[PDB]
Amino acid sequence: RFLKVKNWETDVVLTDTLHLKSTLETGCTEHICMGSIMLPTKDQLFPLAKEFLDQYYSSIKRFGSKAHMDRLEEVNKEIESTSTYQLKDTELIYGAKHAWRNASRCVGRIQWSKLQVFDARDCTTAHGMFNYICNHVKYATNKGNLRSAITIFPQRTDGKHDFRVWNSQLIRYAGYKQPDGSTLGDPANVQFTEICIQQGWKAPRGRFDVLPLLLQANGNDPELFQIPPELVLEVPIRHPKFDWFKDLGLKWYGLPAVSNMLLEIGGLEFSACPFSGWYMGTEIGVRDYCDNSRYNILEEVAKKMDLDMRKTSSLWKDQALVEINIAVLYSFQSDKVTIVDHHSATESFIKHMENEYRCRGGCPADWVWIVPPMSGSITPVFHQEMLNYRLTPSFEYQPDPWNTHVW
Amino acid sequence: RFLKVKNWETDVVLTDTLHLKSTLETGCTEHICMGSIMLPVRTKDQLFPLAKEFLDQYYSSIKRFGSKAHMDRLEEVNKEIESTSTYQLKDTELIYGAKHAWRNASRCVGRIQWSKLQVFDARDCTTAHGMFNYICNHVKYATNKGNLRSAITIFPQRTDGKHDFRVWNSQLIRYAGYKQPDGSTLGDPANVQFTEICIQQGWKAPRGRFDVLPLLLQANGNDPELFQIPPELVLEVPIRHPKFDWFKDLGLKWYGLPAVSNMLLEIGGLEFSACPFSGWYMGTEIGVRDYCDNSRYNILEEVAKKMDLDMRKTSSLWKDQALVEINIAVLYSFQSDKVTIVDHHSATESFIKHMENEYRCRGGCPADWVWIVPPMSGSITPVFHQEMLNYRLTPSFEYQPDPWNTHVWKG
Ligand code: HEM
Ligand code: HEM
Ligand SMILES: N=C(Nc1cccc(CCNCc2cccc(NC(=N)c3cccs3)c2)c1)c1cccs1
Ligand SMILES: N=C(Nc1cccc(CCNCc2cccc(NC(=N)c3cccs3)c2)c1)c1cccs1
Ligand SMILES: C[C@H](O)[C@H](O)[C@H]1CNc2nc(N)[nH]c(=O)c2N1
Ligand SMILES: C[C@H](O)[C@H](O)[C@H]1CNc2nc(N)[nH]c(=O)c2N1
Ligand SMILES: [Zn+2]
Numbered sequence A: 001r002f003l004k005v006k007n008w009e010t011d012v013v014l015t016d017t018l019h020l021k022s023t024l025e026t027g028c029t030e031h032i033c034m035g036s037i038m039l040p041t042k043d044q045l046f047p048l049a050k051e052f053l054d055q056y057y058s059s060i061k062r063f064g065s066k067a068h069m070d071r072l073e074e075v076n077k078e079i080e081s082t083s084t085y086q087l088k089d090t091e092l093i094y095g096a097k098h099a100w101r102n103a104s105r106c107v108g109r110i111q112w113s114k115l116q117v118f119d120a121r122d123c124t125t126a127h128g129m130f131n132y133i134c135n136h137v138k139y140a141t142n143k144g145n146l147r148s149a150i151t152i153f154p155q156r157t158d159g160k161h162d163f164r165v166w167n168s169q170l171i172r173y174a175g176y177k178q179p180d181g182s183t184l185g186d187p188a189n190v191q192f193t194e195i196c197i198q199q200g201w202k203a204p205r206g207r208f209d210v211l212p213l214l215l216q217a218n219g220n221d222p223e224l225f226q227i228p229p230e231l232v233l234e235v236p237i238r239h240p241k242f243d244w245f246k247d248l249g250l251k252w253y254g255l256p257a258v259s260n261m262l263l264e265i266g267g268l269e270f271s272a273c274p275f276s277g278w279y280m281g282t283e284i285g286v287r288d289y290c291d292n293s294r295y296n297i298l299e300e301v302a303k304k305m306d307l308d309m310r311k312t313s314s315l316w317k318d319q320a321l322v323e324i325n326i327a328v329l330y331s332f333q334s335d336k337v338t339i340v341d342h343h344s345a346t347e348s349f350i351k352h353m354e355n356e357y358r359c360r361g362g363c364p365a366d367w368v369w370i371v372p373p374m375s376g377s378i379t380p381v382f383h384q385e386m387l388n389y390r391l392t393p394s395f396e397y398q399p400d401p402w403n404t405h406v407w
Numbered sequence B: 001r002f003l004k005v006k007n008w009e010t011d012v013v014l015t016d017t018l019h020l021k022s023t024l025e026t027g028c029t030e031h032i033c034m035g036s037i038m039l040p041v042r043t044k045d046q047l048f049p050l051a052k053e054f055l056d057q058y059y060s061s062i063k064r065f066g067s068k069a070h071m072d073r074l075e076e077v078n079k080e081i082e083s084t085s086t087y088q089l090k091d092t093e094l095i096y097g098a099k100h101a102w103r104n105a106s107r108c109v110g111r112i113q114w115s116k117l118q119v120f121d122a123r124d125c126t127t128a129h130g131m132f133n134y135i136c137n138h139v140k141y142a143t144n145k146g147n148l149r150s151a152i153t154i155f156p157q158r159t160d161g162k163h164d165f166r167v168w169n170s171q172l173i174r175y176a177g178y179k180q181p182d183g184s185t186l187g188d189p190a191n192v193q194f195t196e197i198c199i200q201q202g203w204k205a206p207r208g209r210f211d212v213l214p215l216l217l218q219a220n221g222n223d224p225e226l227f228q229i230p231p232e233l234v235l236e237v238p239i240r241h242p243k244f245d246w247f248k249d250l251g252l253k254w255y256g257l258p259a260v261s262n263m264l265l266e267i268g269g270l271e272f273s274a275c276p277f278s279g280w281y282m283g284t285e286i287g288v289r290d291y292c293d294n295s296r297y298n299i300l301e302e303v304a305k306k307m308d309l310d311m312r313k314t315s316s317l318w319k320d321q322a323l324v325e326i327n328i329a330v331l332y333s334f335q336s337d338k339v340t341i342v343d344h345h346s347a348t349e350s351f352i353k354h355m356e357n358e359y360r361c362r363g364g365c366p367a368d369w370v371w372i373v374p375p376m377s378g379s380i381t382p383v384f385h386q387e388m389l390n391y392r393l394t395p396s397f398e399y400q401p402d403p404w405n406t407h408v409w410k411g
Helices: A042-059 A066-082 A089-101 A126-144 A187-197 A243-248 A281-290 A298-305 A316-334 A342-359 B044-061 B068-084 B091-103 B128-146 B189-200 B283-292 B300-306 B318-336 B344-362
Strands: A003-006 A013-016 A116-119 A149-152 A175-177 A183-185 A213-216 A223-225 A234-236 A251-253 A262-265 A268-270 A394-396 B003-006 B013-016 B118-121 B151-154 B177-179 B185-187 B215-218 B225-227 B236-238 B253-255 B264-267 B270-272 B396-398
Touching: A013 A342, A042 A066, A042 A089, A089 A116, A089 A149, A089 A262, A089 A394, A116 A126, A126 A149, A126 A213, A126 A223, A175 A187, A183 A187, A187 A213, A234 A316, A243 A298, A281 A316, A298 A316, A316 B318, B013 B344, B044 B068, B044 B091, B091 B118, B091 B151, B091 B264, B091 B396, B118 B128, B128 B151, B128 B215, B128 B225, B177 B189, B185 B189, B189 B215, B236 B318, B283 B318, B300 B318
Parallel strands: A116 A149, B118 B151
Antiparallel strands: A003 A013, A175 A183, A213 A223, A234 A251, A262 A268, A262 A394, B003 B013, B177 B185, B215 B225, B236 B253, B264 B270, B264 B396
């Protein structure tokens, strides 16, 4: 009930109390740990609303004030009448910031309080959504000096009137299968790519074709929009010592911006809530480029480096992996687009944990996700015990819209 | 109830039913996951269920479940418990037990090898000089001049908890740690405390950077005694790099035989508190953890100086570069000297095949992702992409408190 976590590299020990305020369930039992699985009414709403407003009014130091009780009754009347309610702007900003704060898989929550919240609850059409999204991209990109932001569309109602961005991120590259047999472009996006082609997109069929946005307002069929190319900031990938690196032809976009998650605040569901911050270097260098089912380029890079590829024990995969990642970092820095390296990001996150343990009484953290996908044990997060638990407000996964939507 | 796990790189889906035979507790609840937490006499009452359950397992695996010989063994253990309070394992059931404990070890990436385990029975042993002899034979047999063989030696089980056999060292072979008065460390930082116990107990410390610690051995609950392993029995490998000629001048070496001596083997309710087992090393255990943790030899800086990397910003990835070079160096030294070692690409790929085989034949494979994934190059090894179900089966290996915090001194 009072829990201790230990850093085995420094012997720092923190006590967790925050976990007792956990609501949702983990997947785990006393019999089976599931910590490595990727995805494990009027009556219903009022509790959820009350829990949220209680923490809201406590955070501004008005717990048990008139204004607190009064809001609680006003929302109570709203629900009992309309079977739903609206968040105030202030509560919306707080809900959003805290959803990020409670994101146990997010290594960059040291930034949680500097989030620009754009309220788009007045939106009615895909065109409207396209407009908010472009202002979001422009704002967050900031000519390379990236800034955290989320844009929030209208909340779920009956459930047939949902706003969704079909894309997984605002900015991704297309995926094409070939007669040849293999995949041109990002193999991760082949299915979405055909939904765009099958919706009307004329695909340039290149390796790095930015995808069009597929936007759905009010449960309607989604519509295509190309993001003004002048708004998509991209970085050519070169190496600070390998002259031939640039001839591999690699580029990546500067703005990571997740668009397929569902934001839950005080029982209310915001099914379109694209958010953006900036990249940890390994996300691109390790995962996007080197995953066997992504751009999968290790084999081709190791060749240029002329390493011994006849035996795994030469560690050629590892040698090539480092250089690829050196080059991502170097490129972004040289072009002055915000990026963070895994050493810096994890060091930051440990400082954040230490703040949250003393400010809040804990920090939910998912070790499987927090530890970078390269050089794990030489970053401090590796040695840090973490407690994973689910707090609200939260971001949550949700079914791909194309499995659900009806035409 | 059935449970699927998915590999995200191959989309292979596997179904687990084995977890249904799980009895021990995970540390997690429906409300909290403790997956990255480092650490997780019996009455007659608690004892016979544990015995019966273990011997049903044994007799099924030999296709004799329900047999005359299975029943007679049940009744015999039944009566032996209820009269002598405990019972003794047959050799075959001890062999089978020790192999299963390894097979059920969810944090072990090496389990493709589980069925190949030399078991030495030292349950007739009575004294520390007796333990020393058993341990020497084990070290000699497992070393096999560099062609490492897995083995475990099993000393008498716990009885009243007052007459415990323990090996006080955490591994049979390991380097001294010496805290200096300026606050720096000589040798290996993780062994400072154990090293001081040795000094106190009579050990004359050579006080170098790679001094093999003596064995500290407790028999039958008596005070531990000191024994030096014959150096001819201690295979060591000097560390060099195939292309870096200055690498040898760093003065590193490591031992070839990893042999864990502080765990408790539990079989059918019985507690074997001294049970050293040994295999061989995955390269990253030495190159990443032993040499590059901040709390161990910590050579990253010195290697990075020698490679003349940019060290002013972490974003140069100078740490990551040095770490790869050290790791190539470790694998290179061992292979050149014909000492068995396995790299982490090869070990994790073997583990994935083993885990699939285990889902087919056994209905599952408990596995701990936090431990299975190597401490370098995580996502380019296929285990990173493998969802895994962690749960506890017996027989099993378990942690136990260090003996110096529990031992009652006689004088
Ligand atoms: C400031 C820049 C940021 C950095 C460097 C950062 C870092 C990361 C990284 C590396 C991951 C794992 C991604 C993956 O492996 O797929 C992640 C997960 C997450 N982040 Fe952050 N983040 C940042 C800003 C934010 C913001 C502004 C939000 C929300 C407002 C956020 C919410 C999340 C969520 C919900 C996840 C987990 C998604 C999932 O479960 O699949 N991130 N973050
Ligand atoms: C054949 C050579 C072997 C290799 C390459 C291998 C590999 C490993 C590695 C790399 C670890 C993680 C250790 C750490 O990070 O400290 C481990 C854990 C483990 N292995 Fe294996 N292993 C092998 C043989 C065995 C044998 C013969 C047994 C028992 C008979 C065994 C039982 C375990 C147990 C109980 C753990 C967990 C340690 C803990 O919880 O602290 N290993 N093994
Ligand atoms: N299907 C796959 N992976 C898969 C399947 C489902 C979900 C996810 C998680 C990816 N999430 C995108 C994401 C989410 C949150 C943060 C980021 N990264 C960022 N830096 C930010 C995005 C927005 C603000 S910061 C990326 C990955 C695989 C392909 C190849 C091997 S596995
Ligand atoms: N006390 C520490 N760590 C710690 C605390 C508790 C347990 C363990 C795990 C150490 N295990 C050693 C081990 C265990 C099992 C297998 C191996 N490796 C092998 N290849 C084999 C050994 C024997 C057969 S195979 C090593 C590590 C720390 C010191 C500095 C920072 S953390
Ligand atoms: C199966 C396993 O849970 C899966 O590979 C996870 C591991 N850790 C991860 N960590 C991060 N940050 N992102 C990921 O996509 C994953 N994938
Ligand atoms: C806190 C965390 O659980 C701890 O550092 C673990 C992480 N994973 C590990 N994995 C292995 N194989 N060995 C270890 O010592 C550790 N340490
Ligand atoms: Zn768990």
